[PDB]
Structures are given as C-alpha cells and as structure tokens.
Design a protein. Structure first.
Length: 168
C-alpha cells in the first residue's frame, strides 16, 4: 500500500480448438483510463464472479483486429461491464497507433461493456470512437498466430478461446 500505482498486467492463455496456443499479456493504462482499465482487469481475474475465462474471440479479421469479450452471448451481441450497465467513454487520450493496441468495442458513444479488440495494424480511423486502454506486453506472436484463424468476414475457422486469464 505504500507503492505508487503501477499499471496492471493481465494475461490470457489462448487455446485453439481446445489445444493450448500460448499466453498474451497486456499492460492496462490505469494511469490514463482507470475506470476502463479496472473493468478489464476485474473481468480478467474473475474476482467478481464473472468475466473472460472460457470466452471466445468471435470476430477475427486478419490484418485488422481480434475481437472478444462477449462472455454472455459468445457472438458479439452480449457482454457486461463490472458496473452493471454499459459505461461511458472515459476519454480518448490514447490513440490506435499500431499492432498490439487494446481498445474497447462499442455500439456508439458511451456504450462500453466487456467486448474489446486487439489491433494487428494501425487503425487510426477508430481514434475518438473507441477508448484505448492497454497494449500487448508479451505474446504478440500468439495474437499473430490466432489471427490466422480469422477471415475477411470475421468468422473464425477454429474456435479461439481464453482458456485461462488473470493478473500477473
């Protein structure tokens, strides 16, 4: 409790058709977007009784992004934040600068839930529309591997799951 705040690191252990693939770790920018970082962090630990463990990446577009976090409906129509209701766009300080950016999916202004995406390219046209709140720290190669199972319409050709997740 005497330490300065450190941006949390969380991990996903990814599986492909049930076969362990590897671990992706993320830095969450709690210093810039504390409410948005906290949502993701707690969903990743499962400490509130729900979150990402066992959920899938339902939409993967090679060259663009991997989208997941729909732990309720498994298809992009669900998800829930830790706050109950969808929550606000905290800020747009951080931009979509390149591969590895972690950003919130949404359905328009102030509609953040649990769905998120991991960029595999620079996606600057999302700036000011999606809240960037973290970045891949380790295991970007695992993201690259999983991205190969996507397709132009986003449908995955193998089932990509978060077998385990938590905080490092």
């Amino acid at each position: 409790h005497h330490h300065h705040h450190v941006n949390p690191t969380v991990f996903f252990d990814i599986a492909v058709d049930g076969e362990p693939l590897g671990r992706v770790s993320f830095e969450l920018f709690a210093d810039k977007v504390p409410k948005t970082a906290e949502n993701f962090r707690a969903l990743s630990t499962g400490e509130k009784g729900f979150g990402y463990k066992g959920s899938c990446f339902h939409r993967i577009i090679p060259g663009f992004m991997c989208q997941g976090g729909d732990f309720t409906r498994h298809n992009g129509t669900g998800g829930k934040s830790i706050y109950g209701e969808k929550f606000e766009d905290e800020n747009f300080i951080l931009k979509h600068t390149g591969p590895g950016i972690l950003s919130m999916a949404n359905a328009g202004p102030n509609t953040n839930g649990s769905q998120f995406f991991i960029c595999t390219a620079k996606t600057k046209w999302l700036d000011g529309k999606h809240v960037v709140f973290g970045k891949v720290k380790e295991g970007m190669n695992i993201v690259e591997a999983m991205e190969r199972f996507g397709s132009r319409n986003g449908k995955t050709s193998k089932k990509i799951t978060i077998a385990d997740c938590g905080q490092l």
